[model samples]
Every structure is written in structure tokens, then in C-alpha cells.
Target: MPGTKRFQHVIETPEPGKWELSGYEAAVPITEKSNPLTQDLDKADAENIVRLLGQCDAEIFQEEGQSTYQRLYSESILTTMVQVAGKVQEVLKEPDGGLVVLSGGGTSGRMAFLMSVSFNQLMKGLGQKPLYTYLIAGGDRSVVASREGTEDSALHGIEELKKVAAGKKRVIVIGISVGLSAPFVAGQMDCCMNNTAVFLPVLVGFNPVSMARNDPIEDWSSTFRQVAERMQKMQEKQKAFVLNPAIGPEGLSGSSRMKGGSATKILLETLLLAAHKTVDQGIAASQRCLLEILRTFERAHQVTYSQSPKIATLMKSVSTSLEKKGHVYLVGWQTLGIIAIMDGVECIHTFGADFRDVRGFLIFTFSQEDFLTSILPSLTEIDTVVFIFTLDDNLTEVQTIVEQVKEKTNHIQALAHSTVGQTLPIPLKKLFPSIISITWPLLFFEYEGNFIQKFQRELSTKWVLNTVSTGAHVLLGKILQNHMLDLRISNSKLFWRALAMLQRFSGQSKARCIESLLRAIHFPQPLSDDIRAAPISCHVQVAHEKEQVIPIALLSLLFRCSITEAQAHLAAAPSVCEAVRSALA
Candidate 1:
């Protein structure tokens, strides 16, 4: 008895909106905690929805919260950035040209790929050997078609890291797991810690050390928290660094692709830029320099949100198409196209959306010939098509694409970016029924040779696309109390999030809720002792192969019915959002 339990422990739940208090969610990471700012997000209109999003994004750099959770501007995080920047700079000076690996899963993985490629290209332009390589939890295909199932494979991560860094000298592996979950990253860090002689471990997550995921990773010796603690312990000796800053929750619960994703970009880009200055220009990666780079992103945020009116209008049009069960497509080229494609991929994973609901097509993926041959014939008025482009992209080709698209359907829109004085030749601008155009202040100098312009533009597009998609889904009622109640439980991180959603919505005990959720997950057949005692990994595999595990479980719990009856009710409704609302009524 003494070995199993030191003493009797009581579990207590705190009041809502009291996440900062102990026992609010017990060991729940802050990235998974619900935010008070967007609790009623489903009730707002397009304008207010964008405004609410703006408010949520503002929490990123809030100068306070240094004690409860370290802010981006907090002294400790800034100090760590300076330290890590020096490490990045030092590794770059190796005569053998060592490697810098940025890695993660889901949106975190996508961010790694984006920054890794950007920096490599940025360096290649200067006649330097490419210094960056990125490995995603789900493989390279995960860059677009994300592999949530691969996120659970710790061994896969360990192998990928070792293979990628085999020939490099003094490799630095930056593991960016926003929730500190993702066993894929956990194993990679464990590998790094095992041999500090060759590897430098830099773990970037948004939770304090106390809240890293501690769930037992199947087939692995230690949990994610154990890995975080090990790195933090070694951090004192400068052999490793753990950079965890608190940035509050997302607009939707557990949607780390939003706030956490944005913060990841902010911090990592700051590190990249800081290191570049120190190595290339002999400037120090000091506290003051880090702060300047951080604040530039804040200014970018201000400039992006200033177009709220037009952004809101575009969101409403998407909302309308969504309500009609119509499709929405994002068309673009180059870096902007990357954002569009990533957003499209995220919609399916994040909102539990169908593959056909939203799609992002880069022009490179669709040549002008294919556009007329394969795509144009399928266009219909029920579909909404928007082309995202910058001033540098070819306007003549864009006009031609529109000329053909205009013949198929008139639900056309344009999101164009340009300099302050430039226009789209008035006639071209008048082609769209509604346009959301953002004009930026021209750069007077090429301090980094126009690096700032490209960086700022890519980030700004991400914000707008993030808001428009999230807001449209919220309007369509894919949310319940600021939670993605329809989430796909493809991994343990999402399983934890699903448990939180169920307990809150059903007012059931954790044990009872677990039973209910499992029954729904294994709904075609009842859970036997064999199935009930299976490993958690088995459950994730089953969940990934299935659909609507959360919604089915929720419907059954709310109405106290069989899974068959619950699904019957769901099928009766016109939409998922409508289905849940009907049950509540």
C-alpha cells in the first residue's frame, strides 16, 4: 500500500476561467486550457468574430504574466533566446558546416518546414551552403498532407533525427512541440540528450516545465515531461536549452495551429534573425536586438488587423458558401500559395472538415493548361474561389485565369497585396464583386536586402487566412463554447482535448466519461475486456480510421441514447453545427 500510494489524494475541479489556479485542470498544459476571451466565440458575427480574433492574437506579447506564465517579453525567455541564438551562431561557424534541424508535428511541423526552407534559400542567395534541414513527425508529405498518426511514433522521430544529422558536425536539433506533447519530438529530444557530445538539444514549447505532457509513451522508457525536465536540468550547463513561454490559449480550445503556431513563428524567426545578424554582420544576439525583432512582428500584427473591415466582409462570403454546403478554394502562387495550401490542409484536421470542403491550389500544381482542361469544367456557382497574390506575382496570368473562371461561376474574389502607392490598374481591381486589398508602407531601405518585406508579407497573409477560415467555421457553428467539439481524435494530444470537452459538456465523472467515449469510439461493436484493456495507442489507431468519434460520443451523452439513436439524430440534421444545436434544444 505504501509503495503504490504515499497517501490518499483528492481531485478537485476549480471554477471556470480560473485556469491559472492550481487544480483548474490539474496537470493540463496551458496550451490546452480554455481561454475566457473567446468563450462565446460562436455567438459573434463576422466583424465581432474578427475583433475577437484580434484580441486573442494580442495576448501573444502581453508584457504582464511574468509570474503566472512567462510572457514573450519576459526576462527569462528573452535571456534564453539570446543564449540559444549564440548556440545557433556558434554551430554555423564549424569548419565542416554543421546542421540546424527544426522539427515538430501538425501546425508546428508546418512552421518548421516554412522557416527551414526560407532560411536555407535566404542563405543560398548569399553563396552559403544550405545550413538548415527540417524533419516533420509525419515525414515530408506531412508538410501538406499532415500525418497525425505518425505523431504518435517516438521511434520514427528518433530514426528521422539520426538519419538527417548523420554527416553533420555539431548538429543542433530544435524540437518545437507547442503543447509539449508529440511523442515524435519527445523521442528525438531523448536521442539528443543521450549524446550531448554530437547533438545540442533546443526544446521550444509554450508551457512551463511543470505542465509538459506526462502520459506514458508506449514502448518508450520516459514520458514527455521527463524529457523536458532532463533538457532543463542540462540547460544549466549550457549543453541544452529549454525555451517555454506562456502565451495563453487559442481562439478555439486546443487549436495550437493558431496562437501557439503564431508564437512559434514569432520566437523562432526572432532566433533565426538574431543569429544571422551576429554571424554575418558581427552584431550581438543581445537582449536589445531580440526585443527589436520581436516588436517588428507586433507592428506586423497591427498592420494586418487594420484591414479588419475587408477581412470581415470576405469571411461573410465564405460563411455564406459554407452554409449553402458549397465549396471554397484558395488559389495562389509561391510563398503565399504555401500559406493557402497549409490552411486548406489544416481545415480538414482542425475543424474535422471534409476533404472536399476547402482546397488550396498553387498555380505550380495547376498549370494554365490544366486549369482550362481539368478544373474549369467543374466550376459551379455554389463554389467560392479566391486568388491570393502579391504585387510581384504575374497580374496578366491572374487576369487570364479570372477571365476563364468568370465564365464558369461569378462567386469570385481577390485578396491582393501591394505597396502604398501601387494599384491593380483600376480595371483589374473592378473585376471582383468584393476585394480585400492590403497596401503596405514602402520600404525606404534594404537593410536586410528586402528581407523584412518578404517576411512581413508572408506572416500577414497567414494571419488573415487563419482568421478567415477559423471565423467562417465558427459562423458555421463548428464550435461549441470556444471548443472544437467535432475534433478528430487522431493522437493522444487530441484524445486529452476530447476528454476535456466531454467532461465539461456532459458534467460526468472522468471515469464515466472515459467509458462513454470509448463506447462511442468503438461504437460498431461494444467494448469487450480485450478492447477495453488495449493500449492507448490502439485506441488512437482506431480513432484515426474512423470519423465523428467526438460528435457521436457527445450526442449520446447529451441525450442519454444509444450510439445508433444518436447517429440517427445526427443524420436527421442538415449540418454538424446544426446537429449539435438541435440536440441541445
Candidate 2:
């Protein structure tokens, strides 16, 4: 109701029908309402329904006259969305890179967040910095858990948007709503529209897929669909429709969270993968990558699903070997080789694992002679080697390298096209440029989907331990972990989180978490040390209290230390409590 525009309603009565006979006289007290009660004459209702129809499709209104505030996009509208995403990617390719994508609720908002993270990583692999940023209904944590509060704070949304846009940096604003119940999202979107922002709204059911059937999944209030039609005349407006006229399985079940959620991820991933290629590497390159990658994934998919037990057995063997060894080494040429290795590293980052866990090598690109001469002897059975090359050439250089390495390990696998009548187990065609655009995302989706599901499943059953601490002491504890365990608790919020962890782990309450933490150190206050140990504190804080002797020298002790030391220690985690607990252990 807040931040929402008010509109009037109207109704009409049909001509004389069995159900409406003398209805005017009968309805004198109840009010005249005479639409056909029979199913056969429903045409009349359809004929007169034009007046009630919003600018968009059924995503706005329903057959029962119940208004559902949401947006639905027909397939054509989804295509347009792909176009807008492509354009955004184009703009981000420039060094002036700045993107601030915002979302409200429902599948629409979540899709925006998915698109941003995907492209940011994509750009980095292409040797480009991320020009992408975001604001979700819930912030960073919302990606993992829902943030219900963000939907209600219209003022908060507006202020956040304004602050992000105040600078000279260019920012593209993307506001989303599949079910337009979010007042704050709409308010912030309206504000952004007034600025130098590109508004690409994804509206549902805007296209005329068909009007005969009902989409049971329609929102309770179709604000987005209606808003799209109303804003059609606005300058520089963009709308994408992905709503299917036939309705998805979700509609039949009245559960968008099931079908709609999966579809949202598929749509966003497809669009961004396309956009990233176009913006970073040009249309030609993107097309090349798209074709090749698609072919590769299709092959892999087929190989995975094929009845041939040998290929299946081989794949399983490779996967098992790679898992046990914790990594694979890739050898290839130029872009193809570089890209392959990049994907390997990305796998590690996405899984939040160590790089050494899945190490890679681009033999030729790095220096063929140097790689063969120096690293050849170091190759072992624990490492899986994937060789990418062409069949036309024997790749005598590559064969030599493989042969030398095979002596150390039988886990060598070549990624290439199999030649007809060729006894050699080398591939005939892994050189297709199309592999980059297509295969990368398909594999990434498979990787992320499986990995996140596992991670979330594990997290769901896990419980949190907590406590409270003063802002400063807790802050230093997390920093201590950062240095000791290679996890930096950079922010005050993280510091608080660490204190809570310490409290939980040490069985110390808010008051005692700090006690348990500080008791380990001789100094009590930050940036202070014993008068006898004045030189122990770092120079930064020591200058601030030159004449003053720090109380108990406790606070001063943590001041002089580099976060590097704390991060490297195994007992010291990124949180204060974890570090202290470990040190105590």
C-alpha cells in the first residue's frame, strides 16, 4: 500500500442471457452484475475484456477479476532481455566500468544478482576487470539467505541508489519484479529512472501467447505487467517478456518457487554468458566460443548419457582420478589453452577451495621448451593431463611431452577429435573457437549447481555458535585471524561475527568472550602497551598516543602486528574467537 499508486476499478453487465434474465430488476439492491454463468457464452466476456486488460498480459489481471500484482514475460520479451543484457555487457567492457544492478523480490530480482556475479567472473577471465556491482533485496548474505526487510524500506532503497549514483562513474540500474509486491523496489526503480540510468525491466506475460487459458501461478497483484503497459510510451524503455502463453508447470501447481526458480537461473545464465562474450571478445569471438563450447558440452553430455560403457567408464575414471589427485594440468595453444587453464582456476574459486587443489598448466602458451625441460621430470601420477590440439598435425612436440610425462603417470588424457581409422588415441578437433562461449557456461552451471547444492545442504544442518564483544577488541581479534589463517576479517561487522564465534566456542558470553580473548594477551587495550614495552606497539597507533602510556599494554600489542602473520597460522582462523580457541588448543 505504501509507495503504491492508487487506481479506480469498474465493471460491466452482459446482455440478456439465461443467467442474466431480468437481472437489473433482481439486482436493484445487490447492484447489476450479469456476466454469463454458463461456459458456452464465455465469448461475450472475452469480447468485453479488452477494456479491463492492462497494457501487459495476464500477469496483471485474472479471469475472476482478482488483480495480481506481478509481471510475466512472453518468450519474445525474454529475447529482448537478452538484448539488454548484451548491451550492458558492451558498456562494461570500457575502462570506465561501473554497474549497480538492483532487484526487489521474486524471481526477477534474484535473476539480476545471478547475472552480475556471472559476468564479473567472465570479464576477469578475459583479462578485464569487473565493471559490475549490485544491490539486492538482501545484500551479499541474501544470495545465501532471503532478506525480507529490504522489500519494505522504500526510503532505504532510494538513499542507497542515490549514494551509489552520486559519483561521476557511470552506473546502469536494473530493477526487477516478477511478482510486483515490492513497494521499495518500485520506488527505487522510479527514482533511478529519473537519473542517467538505463531501465531494463523484465515484465511477465506482456506478449500475447494466448488468452484462452488461465495461468494459475499469476501473482496476487499484477503490478509489473500493468506498469509495463503504462510505461510503454516512456522514452528509452526496455521490457523483456518470458511468460509462455501455455503456462509453465509452476502455474498448474501454484508454486513458482519450484518451476519458476529453476527457469530463472537458466534464463539469467544463458543471457549473461551471451552478453559477456559479446562485450568482452566481440561478436565474432563470442560466436566462435559459443559454437565450440556448445559442441563440447553436447559431446560431454552425450558421452555422459551414452550407453557405451567404455566411454562412461573412462569419464568416471578420469573424474575419480582427478578428485583423488586434487587437480589436473591442461596443455594447449594460444586462446584455447589460456581459456582452458582459466576455467580450471575458476573452478577452484567457485568451490572456495585451494588453487593447489586443482592446479593447471598451459604448456605451449607459457613456454613449451621451458615447460618441457624444467617441469617434465616433476610430473607425477597424481596429476591428470588433458592435451588439446589438432588431428591434422601429429603435434610431435606435444606427443614428446606426453610420452615423457606418461612415464611418470598413466593418467594422461587427450582432448581432441577421434580420427577415423586412427590407432592413436589423440583427438582430431579440440581447436574449435566456439568452445569458449558455449562450453564454459554449460560446464559452469553443472559445476555450480552441484557444488552449491552440496554446500547449502551441509550448511542447512549446521548450527551457529555466538557471543557479544566491544567493537574494538572484537575487531582486532578477527584481524588476528586474518593474519594467522589467511582469512581477513576486514569489516566491523565481521569483527562482531568473530566475537560471537569466540563466545560460542569458548563458552563465553558477550562480557566474557572479550575476557577469554584478551586474557590470552598481556596487553588489555588496543594501540597501548606496558610502559616497559612502549616500542612493542606499531608506529601507526603509537604516534596517536605518544605521551600517554597505554593501559596494561594489551590493546597496544595487537596494533604493531601485520595481518599476514595471523592469516598464515593454522590455529588462527579469520575470526577472533576461532583464532584464540585454536591458539589455546
Candidate 3:
């Protein structure tokens, strides 16, 4: 019975694919749509979760023949990549006074920070000065902890843009908004529009310009769509670009942090890496060259997914840690640590989990302050701490940490990368019961004749961490049919996402869903007409502080129960997916 598929007529059917259609709910973006392939992901086992994600991530590399949406492999998109690389090539040649700024909101913003640190480190690794800078909506602090409300203010983005570019004579702004819905990036694009000579704005996202956010910002004149169109015009004139390639809907539906996040890195890294090579080694960033660099990322995807079994094992472990009210930690050498930290911090935003639930620390640096002091003296056997490092990093730092970490918790693991004929020290290998070691072909050491690896292993680490974190949460039933049940409604985009989820699950009219949202946002309190009249922004701060609004709203709408009854229903169920299953059944 478990191996074979079975179906029962619901006796009633809900409207399918509400988020996939335009003009239906004012949400047409592919990033917000549910992935049809993962309709049953909410209940998938850990192994299938990883396997399903691998398939979805493979869509990133699939050619245009598979979908009507223009994917990254489309020739048109590749040409745009060449053009952007040409512009970045010029910037890399500048002796002084030119800046390359990467900016975005939420996970987009975090990717910006990660890319900025990464590529700039490449420059430093080669003894070159750093020209790259990262701009997030709320501030740099938003990079570590999310600040979504800042994503709503157009002026805030405009101000941050000017402040970062004040002294630079030439500037290239690469702004990322996965859904093309962030008013913050839209405002900065408009600001760049006014000063066309010194600025070349490149807009990156996963939606077409037509599907870009048309919702008017409170005080801004141009919507995100208008700004995107403006850049589309400039793209033709060789002044700017709009790189919005569809990688299909995410496996976990609208959770853009999955495929979109990885796509951003692959796309941007290709653009930057090609330019860096062009400037450093006189290698041309021709179309063929760009394609080859892009394929390496494809290789990253393939190589990472090959470890699906190991990753699924870790995912189940982390899920058990969460179930026990314990923690999972990552200790890394360098950028590997940053990747872990990004995943750790995003869990709070993505799953609405506490800060202490999952954490990442860097080794032999100030970054480990919390791990040694704050979380020490009482580490538990239930806690899962992992050490992430490569052959290039100091093994002493790794060995030293593992010795300390093992003193309290036996649930420890090592994630190592190396080449053929090489292995970690035997004693080091013996320290942990679990190890995930990904070894590249020795020919990589033979080909190009490089002494070490960086880009490949760092990307592999991110892919593994992404799978583990996302899959582990899915196992805990934080997801329902590819939709995140605990998604925080801290920004305008997310606030609407809550409304969409409510409408999707309860099959209620938008009006009824908004009414339900109101009751849940202000549970056990009467809602006034004035409160309803206020903009969606009016509810975000309150929504940020509330728990289970979407789930509670859906339950009440399905059962016609009072808010208190819905709360009791939710509390009595082990997972929201369990509580909400009756309606679907």
C-alpha cells in the first residue's frame, strides 16, 4: 500500500494553481507559485525530500526545451550574461574609483553579502584590492539577522544607494529581487535611472518584466515593473540589463531560498568569475567561455546531489535535534563558515524558529565567541554539531574544535572535501561517527595544474547545507504540500503570501481570507473598519509578533470555529500539517 499510489475523489475539488495564473489573485510571479512536482512534499520522508530537491535543483540546468519560461540556459539569457560580464570586465580594469555594488532584500540580500565577501576574497587571495561592496535594505546587520520591514521603504533603499556610492566616480549596481517584488530595490533602480552616466543598473530576479511587481509603493511613482522596463530599454542600448531567467517554481513552492538562491550564486559567480579571468589572465569571456564557467556550477549541482544519501542522513539527524528541543551547529574554516551562518540565520526567517535553534560558527576566529562561551559548559548529547572544512584549511583548528565539541556531545560529524589519494589524518577521521567527504577527480589537480580547490568545494558546502536545513525542516512538518507553514509575514511580499496560502488551502474568497487573517492577527479581539482600511503594511508589525496566523486562519475558515477553538486545535496537534490535514482530506 505504501509503495503504490492511490487516489480518492475528494467529492469536492479546490481550484488548483492559484498562484501560477496571472490576473487571478494579483500574483503572477513564478517564484510564488507552487511546484506541481512536489505536491506531496509535506509528507515525504527525509530521503525523498532530498531526492525531490535534487530533481528540482536539476531544473536549474535544464535547457529551454523543457519550459516556456526563459531559463538560464536560454541563448538570450546567455547573451545578457556576456554583456554583463563585459561591463564587469571594464570595472575590473579600472585602476581606481569604480565600485561594483551588490544589493537586495532578505535571502536575496544575504546572497549579495555572501557573494561580495566571496569574490572580494578572491581578489584578496590574489593580492588585489577589493572593489566590491554589498548593500542590504535594513543595514549590514540585516546580513546576519533578517530585517524585512526595511524591504518595504522605497526611500530607505534610495538613501542607502547614495550613501554607498557617494565617493565613487563609476558604479555598477547589481540589485537582486527574486520575485521582483521588493520596493526597496525598485526605489534604488529609479534613483539610478536619474543619473545614467555614472551608473549602470543591472536588475536580477527570477520573473519576467511583465510578471514583475506592479503593486504601487506607498509614495514611490514607479512600480518595480516600471523600473524593470526602464532597465530593459537600457539593456538594448548597452547601458543596463534585466536578467530574469525562470528556474521553474521552487520545490518547496514559494520558498525562493531554495533554487533561486542557488541560481543567484551560479549566475552572478559566472558573470564575475569570467570578468575576473578576462582581466587577470587575458582570457576572453566569450559566449563559449561563459557557457563553460556556467557548466562548472552545473558540475557543482551534479556533484552535490550525488551525495544525496549522506545529506539525507544528516537531515534526519538535524530533524531529530529539533524534535528534542536541542540544537545543530556548524563550525567551518572560512567561507564554508559563512555559508553555514547564512543557513543558520535564515532558519529563523524561513521557519520562524528561535535564534538558538540552529547556529554556525567559524573556527579560530572571533566568529566562534558564541560556540565557546555562550553555548558551552552545557552542550547536550542531543545537540548535533558539524565541522565543515577543506584540505586547504588548517586541520589543527578542526581537530582542536572536535576535541572540545566531543567532550559534551557525541552527535558530531565532519564534512570534508579533498582529492583522490588524499585523506584526513586517521585520528581526525576517527573523532566523529559520521563523515561526508566529497573527493574531486585527481585530474582536477592534473588539469589546469592548480595546487588546490576553492570555488568547487565552497559551492558544494552550500548545496549540502541548503539540502540539510531545508530537508530537516520538512521532516518536522514545517512544510505543507510544498508550502512553508511557518513562513513569517514580516514584509509586504510575505504578508500577501500569507493571504495567498490562506486562499489556496481554505478555498475561500479573498475577502473571506482577509477577514480570517484579521481575526488571527488580532486573536480574541474585535477588528475595526479603520484597521481593515489601512494598507497591508499596517498588519505586518502585528503579524511579525503573532504566531500561526495563516494556519489558524485556514483552520477557522474550514471549520467555522472561533479563534480560540482554532488555537486549541493547533496546540493539540503535533505539527501544523497534521492539524490542517482534515480540511484537505
Candidate 4:
């Protein structure tokens, strides 16, 4: 039962694929639909959870199927990559006042920051000035913490865009919103549409343009749907692009940081890397080149998951940490360190866990503020410490830290990458109780290779950590069925998600659900006109000040009690999942 065969079967047998209508609920976009492969995810053991997650991620590389969606491996998508890369190549040839900007909201914005840093680093190696800029909705604060409220502000988004693109002659804006619904991104796209001479807008998302968010925004003239439609018309004349390919829903419903973040990195990096190749090596950007790169990542996914049994072991260890209400420290070097922190921060956003639940640190430059070193001396058996490294890193430094960490806790694990046929020093390997090491083909390390090699390693680690955190939470009962029941209502998108979850399980009318949600989110106060008239941003702001807003409301409805009584019940319950289950029974 722990074997990977069950997962392989789920993926291979596509009859009534998860995306097909099973009459579970109202029709949502493909990105928000519940994955059939993971419908029973909460009940699975650690091994099956890892396998199911791996198979869910494998959906990203899937080619066109009998289903009605285009995937990452489609020929038409690769051709678009070629076109996008060609534009980047042209910009690189004439590097006078041109700027390349990547912008997005939440995880999409985080990926944009990573890509911009990678792109600028590539240019720095070539002795070129940095012409790349990144715009995350809440700026650096959002990069480190989850500041979901700013994502709903179009005016703030336009301000950030203009500040970054100021004094540039030609600016290429690649705005990413996994569901194509972020008002922040839509505002930037709208700005580019008005100023076509100085800007070329490219909208990257997971949904089709027709399915973009149609919600009304306060003080905005048009919705995201209208802006995306306008871009589609301009795309006809080759003035702009909307690179949205359907890559299936996330393993956890509506968690875009999973596939959305991964695909954004792959497509954006492929485009930039192709342009870098053309500019540096005099090679032309072509569909074949892009396709080959995409295939290489597909191989990376395979290589990472090939060690499925070991990955499951790591997840079980992490789940132990969460179950005990202890901490899991993820320490890494360089870019891998950043990836670890990204995964750690996103775990909090996705699961509404405390920041200390699963934290990350950079090995050498450990900040006492954010790093785990400050508490390493206090670690107990419940605490799990992990090291993420690759072959090229300094093994001596890694061993030194391993020696120090061993003094505190032996509940340690290692996730390492290396070139095929090479292994870690035996002495270093003896330090950790568990290790998940992956080997990459040598092609990634040749001819200005660090760029591609590091990218692949980060992607592989992302997949591993994404599963580790997601599965650990599932094991800890953070999920009810497949939905995140205790997610923080921090923005408009999350507010709607909370409402939808309430409707799905509470079986309440729409108006009744809204009333319950408001009562729970803004407890001790009746639904005032000021609260009702206030935008979603205000509601989520109030919701953030409360705990388990969604779950409490659903509990109130299920138990036929007042919101205060529901809170008391939830406080007495062991976990939200258990509370919901008991009420349903």
C-alpha cells in the first residue's frame, strides 16, 4: 500500500478525470476545482500522500489530453514561449533605456521576484547592467510575510508599477496572477494598455482570458475580465500577449502557490534563459530550444519524485514535528535558502499556522530575527531540522553546521542535489538520520550552466517542500476533506473562498452564509451598514484580527448556535477538522 503503483494508476487511468463534472458543486475555474486524485487525501497515510502529491504535480508537465484544457507541454504553448523569448532577445540587443519588469500578487509576485533576481544575475555575469525590476503587491514586506490585503488595490498596484518603470524608454511588463484575478495585476496591465508606446504588456496566468475575474473593484473603471479582454484584442496586432495555458487545478483546491508558482517559474525562466542564450552565444531563440528546455524540467520532476519513498520518510518526520506542536527548521545556502524561506512563509499563508511552526534560515548569514539558530540550543526531540544543499556547495561548511546541529537534535534530515554518479562525502552523510538526494543529468551544468542547473534544483526542492508542508498540515488535520477550512481571510480572493467553503458544507442559502461569515469574522457586533458597505479588503482586515473565521461560522451554522457559542465550541475542540466532523455527524 505504500508503493507508488496506486498513484501511477490514478494518473494513467484518465476515465472521468478529476476535471470532469462529478457534480461535486458549482462550476469553478480549473484552477479552483478539487482534484479527484486527492479527494481522500486527508485519510491517506504519509506514503500515499506523497505519491498523490507527486502525481498531482505531474499534471503540470502533462500534454494535451482528451480533456478540454491546454497543458504546459502543448506545441502551441512552446511556440508562444519562442515568441516571448524573441522579444526578450530584441530588448537585450538594444539595452539603452529599455527595462524588463515582472509583477504579480501573492505567490505569483514572489515568483516574479525570484525570476527577476535570476535574470539580473545572468546579466551581471555577462557584464551588463541590471535592466530587470520586480513588483510584488505589498513590496518587500509581502516578500517576507503574507500581506494579502494590498493585492486588491488597483491604485496601489499602478503606483508600484510606475515607480519601477519610471525613466525607462521601453518597458516590458509581465504581470502574473495565477487565476488572472488580481486587481493589482489588472491595474498594471491597464496602465500598459493606455501607454502602449513605452510599455509592452504580457499577462501570464493559469486560466483562459474568458474566465478571468469579473468581480467589481471599488473605484476601478473595469474589472480584470475587461482588461484581459482588451489585451486579447491588442494581442491580435502583436502588441501584447496573454500566455495562459490550462495546467489543471492545484492538488489542494485554489492553492496557486503549488502549480501556478512552479509553471510561472518554468515559463518565465525558459523565456529569459532562451533570450540569454541568444544574446550571449549568438544562438537564435526557437521553439525547439524552448521545447528542449521544458523537457529538461520534465526530467527534473521525474528525478525528484524517483526518490518517492525517501521523500515520504521526510514528510513523515515533518508531520511529527507539526503533530507535537514543535518547530521544523529548514536551513540552506544561497538560492536554495531563498526557496526554503518562500516555502516556509507560504505554509503559514496556506495553513494559517504560526510563523514558528515551519521556519527557514540561510546557513552562513543566519539572522537571529528570522533564523532558527537562536532556538537551536533549545531544540527537543519534537523539533526537526533540515539541511538543503547541492554538490557544488561547500561540504566543509555543511559538515561544520551538521556537527553543531547534531549536538542539539538527531531528528535531522537532508535534501541534497548532485550531478549524476556523484555522492556526498561519507562522513557528511553519516550526520543526518534521513536523506533524500537527487541527481541531475550533467547537461544542466555545462556552458554557462549554473543558471539552468540552479533553476532546476530550486524547482525540484520547491516540489519537495511544497509536498512536505502540504502533507504535514493534512496529517495535522488542517484540511477538511480536501479544502483548507481554517485559511486566513486576508484578502478578497480568500474571503470568497471562505464564503464558498461555508456554502459547500453548511448547506445554507447565499444570504445566510454571508450573514454567518460576517458574524463570525466580526463577532460581538451585528452586521452594521458600515461593515456591509465596506469592501472585501475591510472584511478581511477585520477577519485577520480573528481566529478560524470560516470554520467558526460553519460551526455556528452546523451546531445551530450563536457565533459566540461556536467560538467556545471550537476552543474546546482538538482541531477544526475534528470539530467540523463531529458537527456533521
Listed in order, each prediction's TM-score against the native is 0.93, 0.36, 0.91, 0.92
Q: Which is the better candidate, 2 or 3, if ranked by TM-score?
A: 3
Scored by lDDT, model 1 comes in at 0.82
lDDT of 4 by residue, 246-320 (tens): 888888999999989999988888878888877767888888778777888888889989988888888888989
Q: What local lDDT score does residue 229 receive in model 4, on the 0 to 100 scale?
A: 94
What CA RMSD would you report for each candidate?
3.1, 21.2, 6.3, 7.0
State each model's CA lDDT, in order. 0.82, 0.36, 0.79, 0.82
**lDDT agreement of model 2 with the native:** 0.36
Give the lDDT of residue 309 in candidate 3. Answer: 86
User: Which parts of model 2 are misplaced by more than 4 Å?
Assistant: 1-75, 100-102, 106-111, 166-169, 196-226, 235-254, 284-585
Global Cα lDDT for candidate 4: 0.82
The candidate maximizing TM-score is: 1
Candidate 4 collision pairs: none
Error of 2 at 62 (Å): 22
Worst 10 residues of 4 by lDDT: 5-14
TM-score of 3: 0.91
